[PDB]
Design a binder for these strands. Structure first.
Ligand code: A2G
Ligand code: MG
Ligand code: MG
Ligand code: MG
Ligand code: MG
Ligand code: MG
Ligand code: MG
Ligand code: MG
Ligand code: MG
Ligand code: MG
Ligand code: MG
Ligand code: MG
Ligand code: MG
Ligand code: MG
Ligand code: MG
Ligand code: MG
Ligand code: MG
Ligand code: MG
Ligand code: MG
Ligand code: MG
Ligand code: MG
Ligand code: MG
Ligand code: MG
Ligand code: MG
Ligand code: MG
Ligand code: MG
Ligand code: MG
Ligand code: MG
Ligand code: MG
Ligand code: MG
Ligand code: MG
Ligand code: MG
Ligand code: MG
Ligand code: MG
Ligand code: MG
Ligand code: MG
Ligand code: MG
Ligand code: MG
Ligand code: MG
Ligand code: MG
Ligand code: MG
Ligand code: MG
Ligand code: MG
Ligand code: MG
Ligand code: MG
Ligand code: MG
Ligand code: MG
Ligand code: MG
Ligand code: MG
Ligand code: MG
Ligand code: MG
Ligand code: MG
Ligand code: MG
Ligand code: MG
Ligand code: MG
Ligand code: MG
Ligand code: MG
Ligand code: MG
Ligand code: MG
Ligand code: MG
Ligand code: MG
Ligand code: MG
Ligand code: MG
Lengths: 62, 19, 93, 46, 77, 102
RNA sequence: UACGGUGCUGAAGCAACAAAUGCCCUGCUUCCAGGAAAAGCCUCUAAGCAUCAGGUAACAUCAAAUCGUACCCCAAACCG
RNA sequence: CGAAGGUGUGCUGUGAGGCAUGCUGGAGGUAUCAGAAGUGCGAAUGCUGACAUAAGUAACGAUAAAGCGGGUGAAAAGCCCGCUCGCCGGAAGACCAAGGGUUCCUGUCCAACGUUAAUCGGGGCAGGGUGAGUCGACCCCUAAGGCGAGGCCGAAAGGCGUAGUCGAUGGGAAACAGGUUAAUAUUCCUGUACUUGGUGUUACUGCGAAGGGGGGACGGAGAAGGCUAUGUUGGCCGGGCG
RNA sequence: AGGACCGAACCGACUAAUGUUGAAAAAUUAGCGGAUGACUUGUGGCUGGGGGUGAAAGGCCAAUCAAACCGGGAGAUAGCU
RNA sequence: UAAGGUGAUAUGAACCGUUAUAACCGGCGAUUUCCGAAUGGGGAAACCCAGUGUGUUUCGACACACUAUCAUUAACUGAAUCCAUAGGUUAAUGAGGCGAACCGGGGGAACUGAAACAUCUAAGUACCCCGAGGAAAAGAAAUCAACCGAGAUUCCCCCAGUAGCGGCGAGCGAACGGGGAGCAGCCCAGAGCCUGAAUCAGUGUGUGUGUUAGUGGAAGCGUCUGGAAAGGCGCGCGAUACAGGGUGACAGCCCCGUACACAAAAAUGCACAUGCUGUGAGCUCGAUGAGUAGGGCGGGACACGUGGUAUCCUGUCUGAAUAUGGGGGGACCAUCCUCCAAGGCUAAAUACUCCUGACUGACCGAUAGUGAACCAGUACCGUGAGGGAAAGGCGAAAAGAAC
């Protein structure tokens, strides 16, 4: 996901961040409720948000 | 061993004075 | 107007207890664990946008973490914020 | 009997607190000594 | 502080010596005087805190030259 | 690199189970390896209510120091030492006293 | 009645007298030892602004955040 | 095929000592001849740890005081429930500030803690619990006092202080009764209120400050009248006939 | 009217007994003095060690005072034990 | 670099990876809350409250940036007051705080010793303060010497516990000269000629060589005792590797290493090379540091306590000659010798170790060694500064004792 998301534009990567943050809220809700056996999903999305925010800074200039 | 000694505490009787 | 990015970081969990259960069936109120820096306005914006329900008033309090002992080594649980979120007449969560 | 320690958090902080220490060079030397010794609590502030 | 602006003379420490040669610490203070000097460049009076010795240096070098030295060292007058 | 790896067929050089041959099931970071049917121990398993209903004196394999097992050459029919070479880019493992890649 | 406590209904609900150290009272009387400050508030204009800003009133709508709130507190929880 | 160390035994030298070996122990030890010393302990009211003694002695912390039945339990003088008795009641009741900080409530446990036992607890463990436009803080405002741009002063460090800026123990907007939780409530609910500011609309219009004036705004003591909180009695209503 | 009188709260501390390895490193009990004042008390502030403060006792300045406490000079020095 | 991974107590859960995007290691980036110099104002540190300007607004509001102080410089502005100056605003650049020791400077004890004590000592020590650097300081003779000469400074060994100083007590204590380490000389006080030519500094760009990950790395079996072999016994083998560590008892050959040989995409240190920018060499002529030297008074520093006391520093009052001149040669004078103050710069030998790597010990081995082998500057004590512990070992393996 380090080369795939790098092909995307800033106008295609912000919406992607607004899909992950939303997914992270849904997983955080499911986890607290008692549902979700797949606890590893929490880390995948948290690290995926990091990747996307990292590329946003690279696209900006820094 | 021995514990740290106490600071002065009230005394019941005056030491007798011999003079 | 508050960013959706901020509105997705203020609701941590639904709070499960007898008082939360009673509040949800008596005073149509949902008890949420929320971010410690979240405001009543941010809670009232997030619930409306993420649960698609109509919010009347948010009441908040800060729960002070307990001092617990784990193998004669003193520790302290983190303080967290509790939101009593009152919905309208007929909405349901 | 009234004992010597009569607690007041305001007086404690004003007399011995972090900002009181920082206000004078001698107070800053207290902090320097305590950091050098490696105190977990520099002042009463905590 | 008790510092001559011209020369830089300041309090120095020495001893009082009695007949029996008892040494007690004393200070030697400069002969400081606040004096209004007339400059023939800035048609103005300049108030310098100066030693009696510093006033003799101004009489010898001239106020213009001495004020130039103060600006060089970066001392406001 | 590691001279002994997972799936490798090894022989035990020292211990109660000396001469016995087995496959390494896993390698621990503490320089120890689990070899199937080698360093057997009789564990007294406590009765758990949640996961695994019964107790019973369970027979399982204990870790053995990696320096207590040698790679089994198969050809010679005895313990051998592992060396390292470069045969077209990749780092491979070879036996000592014959010189054949694994 | 799970003997802890829930559900349901509901009479009279007035008067007289007494009465504070509380209220009227930041009063009144009197005395000498002669009894904070500043803002909110009210009012006045100056520079300035001129059928604009702003002011007043009514009506409508919106906002009032944040932190404390448990519990002990003449005491087994504070200082000893 | 058993090192050091430990513990017996035998032998041995003038002594400090030495040698051998049973048992314990389970991995070190070290001849000889030299070399170097943190090199030898009974005392120092020595230092640290351990353990004695007095001694199963004194004491168990207000002389307000208990008794019994039932319950739970392995066990009940102490816990729970009931009846009685006694004690406080300008407090030994109730609500706070300060200070403490979970001690609150529930379930569970009784090693240690509780001067006894403990099923109990402010003890252990786990879960719960603190809801505000109106209460308080924050906030606006100042007091003593603090800090203090420039400034004045001082060997250095620094000291003092102006403009300022902080600083409550004082001044400054507004909510009440009833109901509710195991544990919060002027905060939740019900009923009925109130305050301040923003925006918009409509009408009418001199608005505007860091400045001026008013106000805020103040002592001790004493006295009297009018009141209410509150109490008492009667009436009223419900129940009672011992 | 009052540094007026009697007397609770409140402030104090004259006497006695108790206690003295205490219930308590200054108290308890019974009496006792002041109790509108040179009164008492909450909160905060200021004064710093040869210095403070003292209706003055060398009193008090964190259970320490004819020179606080803490660290340093420091292993002061000790013709003494 | 890799077949294993998701730090520890600490399992489990859900997973990731196995020929390369798992994890791990290194270079370079990104992110980097709040407090703290803390810097937008305030404050009882980790909190409270703003202004300004952008951009976004679902009109409820939201996001990001900037706003300390002082110094210097520049622009604009600007009093009493005519010019002006002070003052004000804005911008740019720098500073601020922290840190073991070493270093230079500003201040500076007393106990103690003198068998009392005051001169003296302790000691320019402790301590406080300011400032700097990787070192600092010092430094290119107004120096010594002795009629012969030496040739900046610093450090070491001698000279020597000598000469001296000294209530001539207690004590203090040189220099000359010699042997070493190291070695380096320059610039301004100025005008012209000629030209930017020597050389130290940034600046990229190549070249080697270090550093920050790593790679390969020899050779052993049988038997005996035993729980286990690395031990005994037998017979082999490697050695530029028998340093060291680990492995069920003591292993050159089981493992990790070790000798030895290799390694860098990226960043960076040092040393050469080569462009660019600033810097200005060389030659001739001239100049040669004044409230200064010296003096009187009071102190201080010189081993040197005022003494017969040179020399240095200066708080105070004075005050030359300035090369045909001036300083010194230990009172002072003459002679002779020697040097040129009152401007500055300068590497090396020297000092130190908070911190990093390797290696070493007739150093300690749990009351020792750090206070701390252990979740220690912790618990605990104190209002505070500050004080300040105790506490290591099952086993080879948890096989940590089912029933
Ligand atoms: C106790 O002795 C001290 C001296 O150590 C005093 O003298 C004190 O006053 C004595 N007290 C009694 C009650 O005699
Ligand atoms: Mg002893
Ligand atoms: Mg509400
Ligand atoms: Mg609240
Ligand atoms: Mg009264
Ligand atoms: Mg309450
Ligand atoms: Mg009590
Ligand atoms: Mg030994
Ligand atoms: Mg030997
Ligand atoms: Mg000894
Ligand atoms: Mg002994
Ligand atoms: Mg003896
Ligand atoms: Mg005893
Ligand atoms: Mg007896
Ligand atoms: Mg008896
Ligand atoms: Mg008895
Ligand atoms: Mg009792
Ligand atoms: Mg009973
Ligand atoms: Mg029992
Ligand atoms: Mg009883
Ligand atoms: Mg009862
Ligand atoms: Mg607790
Ligand atoms: Mg309770
Ligand atoms: Mg007990
Ligand atoms: Mg409890
Ligand atoms: Mg003031
Ligand atoms: Mg200033
Ligand atoms: Mg000031
Ligand atoms: Mg204010
Ligand atoms: Mg107040
Ligand atoms: Mg309650
Ligand atoms: Mg009434
Ligand atoms: Mg009276
Ligand atoms: Mg008294
Ligand atoms: Mg009494
Ligand atoms: Mg009287
Ligand atoms: Mg009376
Ligand atoms: Mg006397
Ligand atoms: Mg005292
Ligand atoms: Mg004294
Ligand atoms: Mg000394
Ligand atoms: Mg001593
Ligand atoms: Mg600030
Ligand atoms: Mg700030
Ligand atoms: Mg403010
Ligand atoms: Mg600095
Ligand atoms: Mg003496
Ligand atoms: Mg003596
Ligand atoms: Mg230098
Ligand atoms: Mg000559
Ligand atoms: Mg390798
Ligand atoms: Mg090898
Ligand atoms: Mg063998
Ligand atoms: Mg062994
Ligand atoms: Mg000259
Ligand atoms: Mg002179
Ligand atoms: Mg002279
Ligand atoms: Mg001279
Ligand atoms: Mg001379
Ligand atoms: Mg001579
Ligand atoms: Mg130790
Ligand atoms: Mg031991
Ligand atoms: Mg404390």
């Amino acid at each position: 996901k380090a080369k795939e998301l790098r092909e995307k534009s800033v106008e295609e990567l912000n919406t992607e961040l607004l899909n992950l943050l939303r997914e992270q809220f849904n997983l955080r809700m499911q986890a607290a409720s008692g549902q979700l056996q797949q606890s590893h999903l929490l880390k995948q999305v948290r690290r995926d948000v990091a990747r996307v925010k990292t590329l946003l800074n690279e696209k900006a200039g820094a | 061993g021995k514990p740290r000694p106490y600071s002065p505490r009230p005394t019941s009787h005056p030491r007798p004075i011999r003079v | 107007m508050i960013r959706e990015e901020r509105l997705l970081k203020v609701l941590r969990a639904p709070h499960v207890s007898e008082k939360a259960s009673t509040a949800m069936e008596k005073s149509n109120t949902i008890v949420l664990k929320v971010a410690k820096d979240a405001t009543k306005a941010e809670i009232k914006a997030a619930v409306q946008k993420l649960f698609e329900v109509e919010v009347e008033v948010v009441n908040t309090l800060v729960v002070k973490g307990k001092v617990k002992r784990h193998g004669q080594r003193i520790g302290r649980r983190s303080d967290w914020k509790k939101a009593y979120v009152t919905l309208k007449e007929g909405q349901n969560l | 009997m009234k004992r010597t320690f009569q607690p007041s958090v305001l007086k404690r902080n004003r007399s011995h607190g972090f900002r009181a220490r920082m206000a004078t060079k001698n107070g800053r030397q207290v902090l320097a000594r305590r950091r050098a010794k490696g105190r977990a609590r520099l002042t009463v502030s905590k | 502080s008790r510092v001559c602006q011209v020369t830089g003379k300041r309090p120095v420490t020495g001893n009082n010596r009695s007949h029996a040669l008892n040494a007690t610490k004393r200070r030697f203070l400069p002969n400081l005087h606040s004096h209004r000097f007339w400059v023939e460049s800035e048609k103005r009076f300049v108030t310098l805190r100066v030693s009696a010795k510093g006033m003799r240096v101004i009489d010898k070098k001239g106020i213009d030259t001495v004020l130039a030295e103060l600006r060089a060292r970066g001392e406001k007058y | 690199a590691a001279k002994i790896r997972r799936d490798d067929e090894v022989i035990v050089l020292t211990g109660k189970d000396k001469g016995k041959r087995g496959k390494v099931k896993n390698v621990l970071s503490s320089g120890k390896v689990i070899v199937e049917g080698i360093n057997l121990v009789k564990k007294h398993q406590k009765p758990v209510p949640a996961l695994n209903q019964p107790g019973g004196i369970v027979e399982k394999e204990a870790a053995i120091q990696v320096s207590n097992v040698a790679i089994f050459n198969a050809a010679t029919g005895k313990a051998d030492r592992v060396g390292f070479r470069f045969e077209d880019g990749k780092k491979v493992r070879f036996f000592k006293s014959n010189s054949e890649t694994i």
